[PDB]
Amino acid sequence: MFSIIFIALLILLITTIVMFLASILSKKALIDREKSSPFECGFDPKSSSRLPFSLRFFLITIIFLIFDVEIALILPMIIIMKYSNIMIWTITSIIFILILLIGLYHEWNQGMLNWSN
Amino acid sequence: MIMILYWSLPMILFILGLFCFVSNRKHLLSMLLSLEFIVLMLFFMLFIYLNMLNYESYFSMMFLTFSVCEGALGLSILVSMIRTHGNDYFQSFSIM
Amino acid sequence: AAKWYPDPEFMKQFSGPVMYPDEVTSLWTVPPWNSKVTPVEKSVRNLTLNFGPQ
Amino acid sequence: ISGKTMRGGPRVPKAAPYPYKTKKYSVFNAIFDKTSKRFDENSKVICVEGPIAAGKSKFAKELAEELDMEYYPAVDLDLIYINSYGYDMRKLDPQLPPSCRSYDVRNFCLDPSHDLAAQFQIRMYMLRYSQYIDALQHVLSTGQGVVLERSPYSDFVFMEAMFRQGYLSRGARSVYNELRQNTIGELLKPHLVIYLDLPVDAVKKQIKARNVDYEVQSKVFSDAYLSDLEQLYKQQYLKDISTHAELLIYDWTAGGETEVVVEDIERIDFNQFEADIHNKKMLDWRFPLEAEWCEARIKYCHEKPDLMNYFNVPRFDVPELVRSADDGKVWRDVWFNAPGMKYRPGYNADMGDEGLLTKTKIGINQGI
Amino acid sequence: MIQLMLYSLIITTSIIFLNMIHPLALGLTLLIQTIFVCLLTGLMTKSFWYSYILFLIFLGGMLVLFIYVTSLASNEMFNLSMKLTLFSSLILIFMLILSFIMDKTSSSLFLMNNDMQSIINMNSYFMENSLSLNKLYNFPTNFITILLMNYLLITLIVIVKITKLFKGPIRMM
Amino acid sequence: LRSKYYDHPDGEDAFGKIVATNKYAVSAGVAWSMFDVLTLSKPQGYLPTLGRFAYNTGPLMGMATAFTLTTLVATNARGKDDKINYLIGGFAAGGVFGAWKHNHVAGLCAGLFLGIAGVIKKMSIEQGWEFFPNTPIKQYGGLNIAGNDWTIMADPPKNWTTEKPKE
Amino acid sequence: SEYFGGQHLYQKLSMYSKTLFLMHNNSLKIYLLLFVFWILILLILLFL
Amino acid sequence: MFNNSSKILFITIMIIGTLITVTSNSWLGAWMGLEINLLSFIPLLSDNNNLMSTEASLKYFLTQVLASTVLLFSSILLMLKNNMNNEINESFTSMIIMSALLLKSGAAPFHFWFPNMMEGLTWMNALMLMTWQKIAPLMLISYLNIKYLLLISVILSVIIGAIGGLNQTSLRKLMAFSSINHLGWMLSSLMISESIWLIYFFFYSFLSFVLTFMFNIFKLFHLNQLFSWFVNSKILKFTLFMNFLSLGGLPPFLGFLPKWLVIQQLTLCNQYFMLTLMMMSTLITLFFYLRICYSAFMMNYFENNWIMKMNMNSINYNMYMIMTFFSIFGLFLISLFYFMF
Numbered sequence A: 001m002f003s004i005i006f007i008a009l010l011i012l013l014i015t016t017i018v019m020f021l022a023s024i025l026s027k028k029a030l031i032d033r034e035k036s037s038p039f040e041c042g043f044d045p046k047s048s049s050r051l052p053f054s055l056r057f058f059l060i061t062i063i064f065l066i067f068d069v070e071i072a073l074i075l076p077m078i079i080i081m082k083y084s085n086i087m088i089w090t091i092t093s094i095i096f097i098l099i100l101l102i103g104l105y106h107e108w109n110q111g112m113l114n115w116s117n
Numbered sequence B: 001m002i003m004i005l006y007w008s009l010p011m012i013l014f015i016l017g018l019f020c021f022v023s024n025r026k027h028l029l030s031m032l033l034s035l036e037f038i039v040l041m042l043f044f045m046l047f048i049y050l051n052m053l054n055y056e057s058y059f060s061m062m063f064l065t066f067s068v069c070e071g072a073l074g075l076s077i078l079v080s081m082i083r084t085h086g087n088d089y090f091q092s093f094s095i096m
Numbered sequence C: 001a002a003k004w005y006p007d008p009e010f011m012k013q014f015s016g017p018v019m020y021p022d023e024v025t026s027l028w029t030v031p032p033w034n035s036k037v038t039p040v041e042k043s044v045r046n047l048t049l050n051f052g053p054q
Numbered sequence D: 001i002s003g004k005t006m007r008g009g010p011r012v013p014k015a016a017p018y019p020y021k022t023k024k025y026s027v028f029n030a031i032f033d034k035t036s037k038r039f040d041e042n043s044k045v046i047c048v049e050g051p052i053a054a055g056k057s058k059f060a061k062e063l064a065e066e067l068d069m070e071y072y073p074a075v076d077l078d079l080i081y082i083n084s085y086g087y088d089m090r091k092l093d094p095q096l097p098p099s100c101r102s103y104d105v106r107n108f109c110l111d112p113s114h115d116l117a118a119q120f121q122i123r124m125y126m127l128r129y130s131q132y133i134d135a136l137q138h139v140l141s142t143g144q145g146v147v148l149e150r151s152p153y154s155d156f157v158f159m160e161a162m163f164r165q166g167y168l169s170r171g172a173r174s175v176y177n178e179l180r181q182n183t184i185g186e187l188l189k190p191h192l193v194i195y196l197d198l199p200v201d202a203v204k205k206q207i208k209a210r211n212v213d214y215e216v217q218s219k220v221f222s223d224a225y226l227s228d229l230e231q232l233y234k235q236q237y238l239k240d241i242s243t244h245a246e247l248l249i250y251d252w253t254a255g256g257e258t259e260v261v262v263e264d265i266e267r268i269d270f271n272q273f274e275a276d277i278h279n280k281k282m283l284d285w286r287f288p289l290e291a292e293w294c295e296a297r298i299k300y301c302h303e304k305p306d307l308m309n310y311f312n313v314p315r316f317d318v319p320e321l322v323r324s325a326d327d328g329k330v331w332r333d334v335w336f337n338a339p340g341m342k343y344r345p346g347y348n349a350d351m352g353d354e355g356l357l358t359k360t361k362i363g364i365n366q367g368i
Numbered sequence E: 001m002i003q004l005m006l007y008s009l010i011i012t013t014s015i016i017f018l019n020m021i022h023p024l025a026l027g028l029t030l031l032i033q034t035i036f037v038c039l040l041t042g043l044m045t046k047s048f049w050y051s052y053i054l055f056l057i058f059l060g061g062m063l064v065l066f067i068y069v070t071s072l073a074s075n076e077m078f079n080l081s082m083k084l085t086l087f088s089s090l091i092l093i094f095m096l097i098l099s100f101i102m103d104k105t106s107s108s109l110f111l112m113n114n115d116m117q118s119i120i121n122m123n124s125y126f127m128e129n130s131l132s133l134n135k136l137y138n139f140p141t142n143f144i145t146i147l148l149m150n151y152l153l154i155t156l157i158v159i160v161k162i163t164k165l166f167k168g169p170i171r172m173m
Numbered sequence F: 001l002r003s004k005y006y007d008h009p010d011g012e013d014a015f016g017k018i019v020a021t022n023k024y025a026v027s028a029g030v031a032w033s034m035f036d037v038l039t040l041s042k043p044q045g046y047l048p049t050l051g052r053f054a055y056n057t058g059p060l061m062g063m064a065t066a067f068t069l070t071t072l073v074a075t076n077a078r079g080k081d082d083k084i085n086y087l088i089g090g091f092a093a094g095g096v097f098g099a100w101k102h103n104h105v106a107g108l109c110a111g112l113f114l115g116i117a118g119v120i121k122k123m124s125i126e127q128g129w130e131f132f133p134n135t136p137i138k139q140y141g142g143l144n145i146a147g148n149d150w151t152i153m154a155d156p157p158k159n160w161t162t163e164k165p166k167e
Numbered sequence G: 001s002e003y004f005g006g007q008h009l010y011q012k013l014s015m016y017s018k019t020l021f022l023m024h025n026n027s028l029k030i031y032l033l034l035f036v037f038w039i040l041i042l043l044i045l046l047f048l
Numbered sequence H: 001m002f003n004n005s006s007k008i009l010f011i012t013i014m015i016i017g018t019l020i021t022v023t024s025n026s027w028l029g030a031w032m033g034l035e036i037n038l039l040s041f042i043p044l045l046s047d048n049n050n051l052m053s054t055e056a057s058l059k060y061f062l063t064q065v066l067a068s069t070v071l072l073f074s075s076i077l078l079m080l081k082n083n084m085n086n087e088i089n090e091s092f093t094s095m096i097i098m099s100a101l102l103l104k105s106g107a108a109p110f111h112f113w114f115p116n117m118m119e120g121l122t123w124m125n126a127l128m129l130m131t132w133q134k135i136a137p138l139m140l141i142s143y144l145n146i147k148y149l150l151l152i153s154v155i156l157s158v159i160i161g162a163i164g165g166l167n168q169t170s171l172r173k174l175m176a177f178s179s180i181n182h183l184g185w186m187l188s189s190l191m192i193s194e195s196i197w198l199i200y201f202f203f204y205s206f207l208s209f210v211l212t213f214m215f216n217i218f219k220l221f222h223l224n225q226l227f228s229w230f231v232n233s234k235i236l237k238f239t240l241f242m243n244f245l246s247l248g249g250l251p252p253f254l255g256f257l258p259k260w261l262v263i264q265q266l267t268l269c270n271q272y273f274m275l276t277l278m279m280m281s282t283l284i285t286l287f288f289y290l291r292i293c294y295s296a297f298m299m300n301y302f303e304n305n306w307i308m309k310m311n312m313n314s315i316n317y318n319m320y321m322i323m324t325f326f327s328i329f330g331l332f333l334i335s336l337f338y339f340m341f
């Protein structure tokens, strides 16, 4: 850790210096009211980008939060296979992956994995 | 005291979490933002206590599973909020 | 003799959204009797892009 | 949609109709019996409406026969004043107090200004409402579509027309709207609505053709009154329902032929609207999953009593609709001691029912 | 030593977090703190296995709420608070000063790091996380994991039913 | 700072009694005041908020002090520590209630509400019973609390013997 | 006799029932804030 | 369990969640069961046909999340200092746990959310909230042994629960304030025993189980609707409303027996002063119950006349009539009950 943090800072300093060189090495010209205008294919923009952007994969978005938190429970598997009771480890692991598949196929069949339409 | 040198900091952080959960911000999401802030601090203390035990840290996974579900459920209720009120502002709800 | 029965004026007591109305509460109105509040259809503002020419 | 000529023969149900008149369909019934398996191209709802005395009934019967549709006769107050055993409640009216005296269409055409008119109009809305729900149960449990003469959606026209003529008061109209608002939202709008636009002069001639005693003798069917109905159907009802239901307009299919009309219906396509999910047209009948089908079926098959309990809206500031307490006691005495009203239908021994000692059954979606 | 400086930063970022209003300002504050708490937890433990897991778990939650922030609270405002910047910077340096002149043998947490353990402890010579995560998958505690599974799957049925996907997208109408 | 009211006889340790009663005057005042400033009055600004704290707590301190002084003054003046003293005490706090509420009647009647309240408290002190005593009977089960167990896991063998030890 | 009896008691009880109504007519945040204040006091007494 | 197969699941998972809490031999295990219970109730509670229902789904969620959060906070703190699930001598750290549990159940000082979320619930939802959701919270409070904190909640519960209820006309909101009062009796019964509490809770749920059906079967939500409600036999309507008196705990009816056993034990334990404040405050609760009976005890009314008929569900009504019968004649069966001796 403490080694990694030091190099993490050292890299961040180095990368930071890079633009601090770029900001000075960059040619400097007077900024225009149009030069800094946004790019939207050369025609002025109708709509701010900060309007509410509708969402259609919201349902998947929530399911993503869940499925990760079961990744927290499969990852330890390997580490404790040499040390655990094989029946308990075998049984539980399987009924862990079957539960996941059944959940997935259930929603897939119910059509929730499809986007809002 | 022992509790002041070792357990004070997380508790002071926890109450600051709650004071976020009650302050007046327009958007409901401000509650969700502060929700997993508190959970982050609960993990920190729980992880202090579990480590007083030599090998009991496995229960951290149990706690995290319930952390996401309340956040995940908290996010679902917000979705259902939108499709009846159209917006998530607190002041938009009937005061009762 | 004439016999009194619970009349419309007697029951006006219970007509409001609250027994003892005041300025704050009298302004209110009784909820829908079926207890269903249909959500109201609102505006639809869609983002726009001048896709092209560049 | 597919007439007998198109199918070349009688309707072939996909699966046996569920005996919805005799067995309940609750949640635990829905597990083993599914709803979508019975729906065909003809599983739709048709409302055959029009002005007064436009031969809707004759047209509906013929129409419902071609499309293999169930035909539901238009509601009338005989459904309230004639009990199951057939006894006529109106015979009891000499006993009843004047406010509780029986009131019918005959009375409306003869003393339209009587305060019981406001009562009479709400009853028609309530009757149509119950009948309309009965049609939905038939549709959802049998898959055979239904043909209705006048839906509860179109009933507010008569109340509104009566209001313009001044028969009703402000209060009665205010009460009616609250009932309609409290209740109308829970129905499924019809797939198709057919209108028979008879011009105002024609219907006035046509009414005299029936030569019904009270109607010809009456004054209600004036140019003003009959004109009001025309303005209300086309400007308020038809303009609104067309956002959901397909709309066909004829001068008079009652005077015209129905075989041409059935061939007009089959031309109309009911799938082009299915493409977009949120398309208003036929939105109500768009169920994504099998659960949604069953939920709607449960609501009308199993929760109709709830649907008919929403008509309890307390409004007493209106004096016409209120029934005095002294009358209520007297009316309760006469009404419920009449032959066949002592007990629920099918239990009044004095009317000839037998085996009550060993009888324990009651009807489903039955009263009481 | 950095443990005390970690104490200072987690305190500092928490003070400002109480004062954020813009949802993304909250998010950036929270994301920074999730790094420190993750770092700090592994100091007082036999391994950083849980910091990896915690970091991974929360990052999943970080993305999702941006997606909803960018759809619900997209149009909001920031305000640099000169009171806040001075206050945090004022205390931050103040706290950093203490950590240099602190009896930081006393401030260290008594929880036994892996090296803090004795040399005789035979159970400390196995894989880094073998024993600790062990009885998560052994009788009788394994059934708790199984109970989660239904709980998580049953949750997966709750979201779709609360959500009612078919009745449209989500917009801040 | 921590003085108990009845630590001494009735006509004693005035400074001890005033602190004891003002303690409960402040606590109740703040407790109600917290609801008042958030839920009912809802003042705006950091200064007026204190006025609600002072308004709800201030006179409520005046009441407690008045009762102690009048009760203490009566105890010495009459020459006996009897129930009428606390009755005499209550009417003082009631008088302060009227001045607080600007109402002649409210102070008078509330004194009686407070007057009989104090009398019963003296009754308790003099007869030897308590208002919220520690429960003497505290039941933690039914009749078969040690019998009704439904768990399935086999309890492995014991490690303690009720028998007298062997050596 | 009925000033200390019923009719006044009702006129007072109803008056309080009005006050409790306003105390219930607040945002959800205020009630939770009230709870957090209670927690903070207990925590503060814990340090003592 | 009314609409779809999914509703069947959420009900069961609620049972499992509650059981895990009350069968757990440690705070942490208990806290998990609360989380299981939390998400079992919300989907049952949220319906998008109502703008009000989703608001109810919110206030409950924010409150319960905070309660479980603070509950876990103290439990970690509790065994950080004692290293046991139990505290040898109760102190502040145990008080904090009590405060969360009371808020979890909506006791007096932290009840505000509870009536204010009752506007947008169906009757069957309110029953699940009023009766079952109060099992797990109140049952854990039996472990903690703080007197003054628990005692304060009782005194405020009966007071706030009663006085607040006088001003309501919405039956759903009225029952909430009525339920807060009965909650006060439980906590009083909880500092003395549990077997009384177990008995008292069962009777409380019984009566609420009855009154909910009568409103649920006939979809009544406002006092006016009671007067407009049509019944064939005014004798029948008169008798159905005689359940409110039992809910008021009048001795001729079954609903007093619960109140009765809570006094024969509180008095046995010398808590005389508490009973005065409680029993006296119950009168105010008994008051607005009579305001409902105005629509039954008088028995000739001015009623709207576009209804001649009662349309009611059989099975609910069939079970409701059975439950009502005992609610009026259940007293003579005290001989049979052997759980008080």
Ligand SMILES: Nc1nc2c(ncn2[C@H]2C[C@H](O)[C@@H](COP(=O)(O)OP(=O)(O)OP(=O)(O)O)O2)c(=O)[nH]1
Pocket: D051, D052, D053, D054, D055, D056, D057, D058, D059, D074, D105, D108, D109, D121, D124, D155, D158, D159, D162, D215
């Ligand atoms: N006041 C009132 N009268 C109605 C209503 N609906 C129908 N009627 C009355 C109006 C006429 O007096 C009479 C006309 O009956 P119909 O138009 O329904 O004719 P019917 O169905 O008997 O056969 P047909 O239309 O010729 O096919 O019934 C209503 O909603 N309110």
